[PDB]
Design a protein around this ligand. Structure first.
Ligand SMILES: N#Cc1cc(Cl)cc(Oc2c(Br)ccc(Cc3n[nH]c4nnccc34)c2F)c1
Lengths: 402, 551
């Protein structure tokens, strides 16, 4: 086992990302962990002649765990892990009855990193009140959270899963970052038996918002839903015309002509108004369209996925995934505080996206940057981190998605 | 000495060779001063005479009755690699734990007591030129970290970290703060046990090339450090004098604001808003700005706050932090952090505007966020908050607002003015209320505009505006409808922009118009507001669009 030479582009430099402040208990968690890793040879202390930095966090059970945010290094290294050593994503995975996610990131710690690449994996454990300069380390082995790690390890992963695949030709296994995604159509007891079997295979090489399993063949579109009403006021038809006007941008065939005819000229909002036959047909034909997926929108692998989320109240959140604005590839919903709920939704939506497209979306998050950045690791459980930015939800888009 | 510590390997930037900058011929006195300075440094190992083969050069200068040698490393600095940042921040006194005994040690000749990478020394070449540059100059290169070189602060810092490491492991409850050339050392040992522990630190340091002051030369408390005063069981800021002036220049007000801001860390209630408004913003440094009555009022309140000295207390890690916030007029917030009621560790202020339009609940939340971060930095934990907002008000706001908003453990405290929402929009159309369909249109070339309404009661109206935008006319239209309206009203707009602003229940705005709208919304008993798509021929909207477009 000797190293694969890793490269950046000719003209991109390594990451120089600031460390976020950490609480005392996480700082202490991180020095326990990192003291161990150094003893084991996985990381080494470094000097100031390494100008790179990547942020580090502590997450959870009761067991603390190190999470390195390699988002910048991943971007800066995309030619290597995507074009040079890309792992092809299987279209059948989303079709399976059950998909189980297994953590396999312990595998990487046994495989040494190209010594000329090690510097770019620099990180810092900070100090309370800037007492000490705080502890700088770099990786000597394939790090968890870097997309180059599975890229490099896929040759060995393929050996490991070979008998199991051979013996189970209708089970699909996909590696994304530090996890294996394992799908079958088996009944759930047999499915779980095969997961235990796979764990034993992996164990012979030293190894191991969601629920127990994912169930992607049962994943749906959240239809833009038009109300059924006893009685229709002017306000109600206005709201309806608004929804339908905005759905007409996404779906070929939406129509509102008939409903707008109802709204004559300067009525009271409370005024009940009769529902015509043409209006009712248009309404019914719209409903059928909204049951179906969007005609004309397809996943383009050369484009970034983006995810928008709306806070709907009462622990309810809605979301849309698209590549061109409002051309939805998927839509859905998620249901004790706002930041915790939001992080759970982000992780749920990311997992779905990995299973469907083999990549993560960039999130548009309806929250203050500083609040999110203070609190997210407090509830984060995943071993990846998606790209996000911070957004003001237009108040109407929330209305149209329930 | 020069530390025996191993060196840090150092590179130039990937595509770059070392500097070859030409030594300007120098005055005789300067040449002589340099020769004398360099001879002495040479004899201590700091610099070494070098051969003719070395092609690199950096300019040297001498300035005054002692002479000083200045090396201009500008070019080398451009050519040398980046280093990691020295520090993420600076110690705050409020974050210090009280020690029985504390010692300041400053390292003597810090940079010159640390070796330079042998492979890098050649790049540090400089030339003492001969008189009228007739003959070859005397050539030297550094063996140690040069003054003014980009790598010196970082390499020094990490040399001290390595060196201190063993001493920390054997003495895990002695506090050593590293800051530039300084070491600040604190223990809970009795005087003599500490004095002895310091001696073995000093000795451990001297073994590694680093000299330090004697017990006869060590500073005594209080420490004047970085604008603070650090006493045995309290801290404060060093004395602030607020000038008395007939005429205040731009320069004078800026310096005033800086001082006030500095004082705000421990003096509660310091305000700076009205003084900062004076600095917007076209004005010359020595240009005089007359103080408004508001700035005058604010300056006088600050003077009362500063008339008597205030101190802060140190941190006790076995108690919670409590943070209290008060509203001090509009846009301004003040806070205090303490562990035991009213012995403040520190104080501060918040008085910002995220966005053109906002309310007090949003500002309070932002203030809590700022304070929370500050606390994690200083103490590694979040404080418990005491806030001038009822739980019901907060619950009503966060449950209904479109952003995720969260604040950690807090309690209500009745310290007026209390934070409240000043109006609330109806959730449904109001029966027996007149519906106003509003609209605005502005010509793009003339910048003329028209704002108006049509209603279900048959009323109609249009006004004329000059140098407006479409945004401004949609707001103008809403203000009309509020003006001509009863105490209950439904308003239909096709502006998402205006709807967004008003739905967030602003109470404060950069916009004159928006503040006029807010006055009205407060006076009303009920307002319902609805949006429709424009140009889709929706009754009412179609009509106002007509009278409004005419132009
Ligand atoms: N100058 C200086 C200085 C600056 C810092 Cl940031 C810390 C410092 O040492 C202290 C340490 Br180490 C630890 C605690 C305190 C506060 C303190 N406790 N007991 C004291 N007796 N005298 C002065 C200060 C203190 C210190 F001032 C000295």
């Amino acid at each position: 086992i000797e190293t694969v030479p890793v490269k950046l582009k000719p003209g991109m430099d390594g990451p120089k990302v600031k460390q976020w402040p950490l609480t005392e208990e996480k700082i202490k968690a991180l020095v326990e962990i990192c003291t161990e890793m150094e003893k084991e040879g996985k990381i080494s202390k470094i000097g100031p002649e390494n100008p790179y930095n990547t942020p580090v966090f502590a997450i959870k059970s009761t067991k603390w765990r190190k999470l390195v945010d390699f988002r910048e290094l991943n971007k800066r290294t995309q030619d290597f892990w995507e074009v040079q050593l890309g792992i092809p994503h299987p279209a059948g995975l989303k079709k399976k009855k059950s998909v189980t996610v297994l953590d396999v990131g312990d595998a990487y710690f046994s495989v040494p990193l190209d010594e000329d690449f090690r510097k770019y994996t620099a990180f810092t454990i900070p100090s309370i009140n800037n007492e000490t300069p705080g502890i700088r380390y770099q990786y000597n082995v394939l790090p968890q959270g870097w997309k180059g790690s599975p890229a490099i390890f896929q040759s060995s992963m393929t050996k490991i899963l070979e008998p199991f695949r051979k013996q189970n030709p209708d089970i699909v296994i996909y590696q994304y970052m530090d996890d294996l995604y394992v799908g079958s159509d088996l009944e759930i007891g047999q499915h779980r038996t095969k997961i235990e079997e796979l764990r034993q295979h992996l164990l012979r090489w030293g190894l191991t918002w969601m629920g127990y399993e994912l169930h992607p063949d049962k994943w749906t579109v959240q239809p833009i839903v038009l109300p059924e009403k006893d009685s229709w006021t002017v306000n109600d038809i206005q709201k309806l015309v608004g929804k339908l006007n905005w759905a007409s941008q996404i779906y070929p065939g939406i129509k509102v002509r008939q409903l707008c005819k109802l709204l004559r000229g300067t009525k009271a909002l409370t005024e009940v108004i009769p529902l015509t036959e043409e209006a009712e047909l248009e309404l019914a034909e719209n409903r059928e369209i909204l049951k179906e997926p969007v005609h004309g929108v397809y996943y383009d692998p050369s484009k970034d996925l983006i995810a928008e989320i709306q806070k709907q109240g009462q622990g309810q959140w809605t979301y849309q995934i698209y590549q061109e604005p409002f051309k939805n590839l998927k839509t859905g919903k998620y249901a004790t505080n706002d930041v915790k709920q939001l992080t759970e939704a982000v992780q749920k939506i990311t997992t779905e996206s990995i299973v469907i497209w083999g990549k993560t979306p960039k999130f548009k998050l309806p929250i203050q940057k500083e609040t999110w950045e203070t609190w997210w690791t407090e509830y984060w459980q995943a071993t990846w981190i998606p790209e996000w930015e911070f957004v003001n939800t237009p108040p109407l888009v929330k209305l149209w998605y329930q | 000495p020069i530390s025996p510590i191993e060196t840090v390997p150092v590179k130039l930037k990937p595509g770059m060779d070392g500097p070859k900058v030409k030594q300007w011929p120098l005055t005789e006195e300067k040449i002589k001063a340099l020769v004398e300075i360099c001879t002495e440094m040479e004899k201590e190992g700091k610099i070494s005479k070098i051969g003719p083969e070395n092609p690199y050069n950096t300019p040297v200068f001498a300035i005054k009755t002692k002479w000083r040698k200045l090396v201009d490393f500008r070019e080398l600095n451009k050519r040398t690699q980046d280093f990691w940042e020295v520090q993420l921040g600076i110690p705050h006194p409020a974050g210090l734990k009280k020690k029985k005994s504390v010692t300041v040690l400053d390292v003597g000749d810090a940079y010159f007591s640390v070796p330079l990478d042998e492979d890098f020394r050649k790049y540090t070449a400089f030339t003492i030129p001969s008189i009228n540059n007739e003959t070859p100059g005397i050539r030297y290169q550094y063996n140690v970290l040069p003054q003014g070189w980009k790598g010196s602060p970082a390499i020094f810092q990490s040399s001290m970290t390595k060196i201190l490491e063993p001493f920390r492991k054997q003495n895990p409850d002695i506090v050593i703060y590293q800051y530039m050339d300084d070491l600040y050392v604190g223990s809970d040992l009795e005087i003599g046990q500490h004095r002895t522990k310091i001696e073995e630190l000093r000795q451990h340091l001297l073994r590694w090339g680093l000299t330090t002051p004697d017990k006869k030369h060590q500073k005594e408390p209080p420490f004047l450090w970085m604008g603070y005063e650090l006493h045995p069981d309290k801290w404060t800021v060093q004395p602030i004098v607020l000038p008395e002036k007939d005429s205040w220049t731009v320069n004078d007000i800026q310096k005033l604001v800086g001082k006030l801001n500095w004082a705000s860390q421990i003096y509660p209630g310091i305000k700076v808003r009205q003084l900062c408004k004076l600095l917007r913003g076209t004005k010359a440094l020595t240009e005089v700005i007359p103080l408004t009555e508001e700035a005058e009022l604010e300056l006088a309140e600050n003077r009362e706050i500063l008339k008597e000295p205030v101190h802060g207390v140190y941190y006790d890690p076995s108690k919670d932090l409590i943070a209290e916030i008060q509203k001090q007029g509009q846009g301004q917030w003040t806070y205090q952090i303490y562990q035991e009621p009213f012995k403040n560790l520190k104080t501060g202020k918040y008085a910002r505007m995220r966005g053109a339009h906002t309310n007090d609940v949003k500002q309070l939340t932002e203030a809590v966020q700022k304070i929370t971060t500050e606390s994690i930095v200083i103490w590694g934990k979040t404080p418990k908050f005491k806030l001038p907002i009822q739980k019901e008000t907060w619950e009503t706001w966060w449950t209904e607002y479109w952003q995720a908003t969260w604040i950690p453990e807090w309690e209500f405290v009745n310290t007026p003015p209390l934070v409240k929402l000043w109006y609330q929009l109806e959730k449904e159309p109001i029966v027996g209320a007149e519906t106003f369909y509003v609209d605005g249109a502005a010509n793009r070339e003339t910048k003329l505009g028209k704002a108006g309404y049509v209603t279900n009661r048959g009323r109609q109206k249009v006004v004329t505006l000059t140098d407006t935008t479409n945004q401004k006319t949609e707001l103008q239209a809403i203000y009309l409808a509020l003006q001509d309206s009863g105490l209950e009203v439904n308003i239909v707009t096709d502006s998402q922009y205006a709807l967004g602003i008003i739905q967030a229940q602003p109470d404060q705005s950069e916009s004159e118009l928006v503040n006029q709208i807010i006055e009205q919304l407060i006076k009303k008993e009920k307002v319902y507001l609805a949006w429709v798509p424009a140009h889709k021929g929706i009754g009412g909207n179609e009509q106002v669009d007509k009278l409004v477009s005419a132009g």
